[PDB]
Amino acid sequence: YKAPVPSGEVYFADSFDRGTLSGWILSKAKDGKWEVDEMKETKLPGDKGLVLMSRAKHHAISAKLNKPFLFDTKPLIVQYEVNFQNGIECGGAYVKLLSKTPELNLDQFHDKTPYTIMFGPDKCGEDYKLHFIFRHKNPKTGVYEEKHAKRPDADLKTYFTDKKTHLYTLILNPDNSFEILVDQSIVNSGNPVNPSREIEDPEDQKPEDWDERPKIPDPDAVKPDDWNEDAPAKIPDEEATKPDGWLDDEPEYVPDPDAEKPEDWDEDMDGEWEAPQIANPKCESAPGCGVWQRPMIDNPNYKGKWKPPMIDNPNYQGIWKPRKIPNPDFFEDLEPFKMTPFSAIGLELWSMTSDIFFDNFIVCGDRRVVDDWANDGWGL
Numbered sequence: 001y002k003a004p005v006p007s008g009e010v011y012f013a014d015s016f017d018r019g020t021l022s023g024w025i026l027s028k029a030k031d032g033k034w035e036v037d038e039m040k041e042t043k044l045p046g047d048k049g050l051v052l053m054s055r056a057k058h059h060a061i062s063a064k065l066n067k068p069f070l071f072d073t074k075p076l077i078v079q080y081e082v083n084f085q086n087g088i089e090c091g092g093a094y095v096k097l098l099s100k101t102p103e104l105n106l107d108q109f110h111d112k113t114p115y116t117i118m119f120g121p122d123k124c125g126e127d128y129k130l131h132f133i134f135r136h137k138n139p140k141t142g143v144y145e146e147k148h149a150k151r152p153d154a155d156l157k158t159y160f161t162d163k164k165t166h167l168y169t170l171i172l173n174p175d176n177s178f179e180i181l182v183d184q185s186i187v188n189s190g191n192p193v194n195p196s197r198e199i200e201d202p203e204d205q206k207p208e209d210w211d212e213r214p215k216i217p218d219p220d221a222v223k224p225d226d227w228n229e230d231a232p233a234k235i236p237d238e239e240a241t242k243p244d245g246w247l248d249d250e251p252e253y254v255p256d257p258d259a260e261k262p263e264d265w266d267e268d269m270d271g272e273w274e275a276p277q278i279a280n281p282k283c284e285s286a287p288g289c290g291v292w293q294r295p296m297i298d299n300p301n302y303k304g305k306w307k308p309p310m311i312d313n314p315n316y317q318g319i320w321k322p323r324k325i326p327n328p329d330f331f332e333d334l335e336p337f338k339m340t341p342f343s344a345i346g347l348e349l350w351s352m353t354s355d356i357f358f359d360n361f362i363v364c365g366d367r368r369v370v371d372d373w374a375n376d377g378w379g380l
């Protein structure tokens with residue numbers, strides 16, 4: 001079967017139902033490429049999606065929205081689906097909402113291209129992350145400070161290994177609060193962080209007389225006389241004896257009969273050749289070779305080193321700290337949701353394995369209009 005058609009407005013939605021990555025722009029900045037076929041071993045004869053396919057760096061692809069999404073009297077809703085068909089070792093398959101600007105040379109989709117929000121799955125080695133970041137404009141320095149969003153309560157792993165297509169929803173209400181419904185289940189929610197507070201005088205110094213040492217050695221207890229601290233942990237076994245067929249003259253190891261410093265070697269500093277030692281064979285059929293070593297047994301009188309007991313330090317003036325002195329770059333927490341608008345949705349992804357499946361890219365402001373395209377697309 002198949003169907004999924006827009007309900008209300010658009011902002012951006014793409015189902016690749018047409019069948020082509022018609023309408024997407026490979027970067028040119030500076031690799032891997034993309035295609036739009038069915039799912040590997042599908043189960044839906046018709047739903048093909050934009051799919052990564054390499055190991056190089058799909059650092060590319062993006063597309064212009066249908067209309068600049070501004071952050072005012074409508075919340076933001078973005079949602080797509082991915083599915084690491086070959087499971088991800090270490091890579092990312094999150095979306096990037098390219099900010100608005102006069103001429104947005106997409107084709108030049110650089111890496112430090114300004115975006116407004118980043119969002120989606122990423123997991124390297126064994127971290128399993130589902131991001132959501134929204135760069136805030138330092139309303140003073142004017143610096144673009146990317147404010148993250150705490151992890152979710154729920155392990156994610158499964159979503160990256162069950163080689164089965166999952167869905168990601170992102171909703172940011174002007175409230176300045178959110179949640180990250182993934183496969184319908186809101187796995188995360190909320191409402192560094194934009195405004196600040198103070199700072200400490202980096203010109204303050206932990207004085208030397210300031211003791212931050214909880215416990216200390218009881219200056220009373222003293223190393224006992226029997227505690228000979230110079231006694232080794234090992235002393236020879238005078239009970240032992242040197243086997244008889246032992247070869248005192250036969251040299252432990254011998255220089256290998258392949259001793260040839262490659263005519264590619266530069267003693268001048270490729271080091272200073274030395275023929276690897278082999279292993280004098282004469283010894284193979286012998287008790288031992290070269291200088292004998294009377295085996296060591298443990299040592300009865302070994303002790304260690306004076307272990308004076310620890311005791312609280314009557315003067316441990318708690319761990320010292322800089323004397324908090326005012327906030328110059330002190331800014332403010334407006335209605336954050338009023339972040340710079342974006343005009344494109346792109347994907348600069350590192351990755352590792354191929355066959356990553358992307359699809360149903362949809363971006364609307366209404367929740368229903370989005371909840372439908374969902375049960376329409378993914379729901380199928």
Ligand SMILES: [Ca+2]
Pocket residue numbers: 014015016017047048049359360
């Ligand atoms: Ca599709």
